[model samples]
Target chain A: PKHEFSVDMTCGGCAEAVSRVLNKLGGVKYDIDLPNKKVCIESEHSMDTLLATLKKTGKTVSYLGLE
Target chain B: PKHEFSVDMTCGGCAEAVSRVLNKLGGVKYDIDLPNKKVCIESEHSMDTLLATLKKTGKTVSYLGLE
Candidate 1:
């Protein structure tokens, strides 16, 4: 699965946080675009599970979807 | 200075958030212990500056100061 999300992160650190979190989900591959403030994850997880998991980092995940 | 912080992050993603923000300062090195829920940074930024930067992630900063 491919996931695109709009998370409120201003710099590479925030991107790192997002990347770190996604990778922890196990057997997931992802890339974070700091400029666009988005992340694409190739993993097996429900949108709700992913959203809630990311939100745990205290980032405002404005939107998330499967592509 | 070596900085230690207690930030409210539950998963590796939360740890990544802290690591990412600190790395952005450049010329700094840090290690995040997810099991212990702590981050130790090797940098020169003041406690206040570091605290403020980490707070931007919207995670609750339980404690932060130079160690």
Candidate 2:
């Protein structure tokens, strides 16, 4: 399944931090659209895991549900 | 004619500030997308005037076009 998160990323640094954290989690393909402030992820992992990993970067995350 | 301004608005408060200033200028119609950080404006005014008005509110403005 795939999920999209609309987040409030202020700049490239914010996106890079989130990208690095998400990349650490195996089997996830993600794309971050800074202009749109959205992150789209394709993964089989649980939402809890994804959410926790993202929160570790100290950024607010709002799940937009499965794609 | 109309002009679109893509500005870096951080939050709802930022949007409100820009909206208020733009609204004060008669004959201008503006729709602000907070999440996208974009402001679409339909106005018959010089970009200089619009930019000056926005700068007065401590906002940065980039003219997208003369739509």
Candidate 3:
């Protein structure tokens, strides 16, 4: 499934960090748009793990919807 | 001189904010490493302006040194 979420970020470095973190979680594909402040995630992992991982990065995550 | 600094940023969005702020200062060349959490800047601008710009992005800036 694809999920869209809002996050707080400002640059490529911030995007890199989030990418590194989520990619490490395994079984997830993400497309992050820094300028738009949005992240699209496709994963086999549960939403709980995804949300918690984002929190651990000290960033906010708000779910917009799922597809 | 080139300067190295650190800031709190967990994703590309944060980095984008920082980059936008610094780039707007008009005379700085920056290379940011997300994994390393380091920012290298080459600029003729005053440290005051750099620090203030970073603060505007809600990120802390600590100067490592000038090279």
Candidate 4:
């Protein structure tokens, strides 16, 4: 599934971080859009799992749903 | 126009930086999805201007278009 997140990103460092951690989970592939501020994750893990894990990213997720 | 970019986020610091800089530009509102690597910017600046400015964020924008 394509899981999208509403993240609050601010810099190159943030963009790198969001893509780094999530993409490694469940050996998943991700499409992180920092310039436009969007995230789409294709992972084997559940959305709940992804959501909680992403909390560590420190960005606010206003929305999380299948796309 | 909404400009979305493909970014590579690696850490919390990275996410912070991406948002920090962009949001400051012309006092724009942004929706950053780090997990999905996406960014949505609603600004008065020209698409070209926004594109060049986003390059400084260091995230790879694979696809940028109106949404």
Candidate 5:
């Protein structure tokens, strides 16, 4: 399933953190739009799992439902 | 003054978030040692201010005092 999230990322670095967490989670393909503060991800992982991973970046993260 | 901090960064991405926050704070010359999970910074900002800025990244940040 593909999911969209709104993350309060202000720069590439913040995006990097978002990337790191997702990569660590594994089994996920994701795109981070820094300027738009959005992250789109396709994964078999559950929403709770993905949400927890994204929250690890320490930024404000909101699940925007399926995309 | 040079300030040292212990930030629990797991990857280059985490370092990027640290970099982003420091850059956003401005007037800060900083280095992120990802392998060591340490951040060394030279800045005129107060410890409280720098600490707060680093905390914005949502990582576990500890001041290691002046370096």
Candidate 6:
């Protein structure tokens, strides 16, 4: 399933942190749009799992439902 | 002395990571300008220490010398 999220990412490093956590979660494919403050992800992982992973970066995150 | 640095920070989380490392190093006062990708710091710590501390964020870092 494809999911979209609004992540409060302001720069490359914040995007990188988002990437790091998503990668660590594994089995998930994702893209970060830094300027747009958005993250689009395709994963078999549950929303709970994915949300928790993004939260680890300590940045504001909101799931935007399936994309 | 006050020092200026160029750190590849793109967002608030990157700035947070910068703050974390600087705080962990202790006795260092700092400011981050995310848009400008700049960090200004005042500390008794050595240049090596400050640079090393910033590098811990795994972001590109360069000392811009005393500011």
Provide the overall lDDT of each model, using Cα atoms, as 2-decimal numbers.
0.68, 0.71, 0.73, 0.66, 0.82, 0.81
When 4 and 5 are scored with DockQ, the better candidate is: 5
Show how many residue pairs clash in every candidate, following the order shown: 1, 1, 14, 42, 0, 4
DockQ of each: 0.09, 0.02, 0.15, 0.10, 0.13, 0.22
Kindly give the stretch of ten consecutive residues in candidate 4 chain B with the minimal lDDT sum.
Answer: B52-61
All predictions: root-mean-square deviation over Cα?
11.0, 13.3, 10.1, 13.4, 8.3, 5.6
Candidate 3 residue A33 C-alpha distance from true site, Å: 0.8
Worst 10 residues of 3 chain B by lDDT: B52-61
* Clashes by residue pair, model 6: A10-B10, A11-B10, A11-B11, A12-B10
**Candidate 2 local lDDT, A1-67, one digit each (tens):** 8888876676665566567667667789999998988988899899888876665443556888886
After TM-score superposition, the amount by which residue A1's alpha carbon in candidate 2 deviates from its true location, in angstroms, is 1.0
**Model 2: colliding residue pairs:** B2-B67
lDDT score, candidate 6: 0.81
Ranking by DockQ: 6, 3, 5, 4, 1, 2
Residue-level lDDT tens digits of model 2 in B1-67:
6777877676564565566667666678888888887888777777887776655443445777765
**Residues B1-67, candidate 4, lDDT per residue (tens digit)?**
6777665665555556567557656656678786887778877788777665555454455555777
**Where's the lowest-lDDT run of ten residues in candidate 2 chain A?**
A52-61
Error of 3 at B37 (Å): 6.1
State how far residue B30 of model 1 sits from its true place (Å). Answer: 22
lDDT preference between candidates 3 and 6, better one: 6
Q: Is candidate 1 or candidate 3 better by DockQ?
A: 3
* Superposition TM-score, candidate 6 onto the true structure: 0.56
lDDT of 3: 0.73
- Candidate 3's C-alpha runs over 4 A off are B1-67
For model 6 chain B, where is the 10-residue window of minimal lDDT?
A: B52-61
Query: lDDT tens digits, residues A1-67, model 5?
Result: 9999999776566676677678768999999888888999999999999898776565668999996
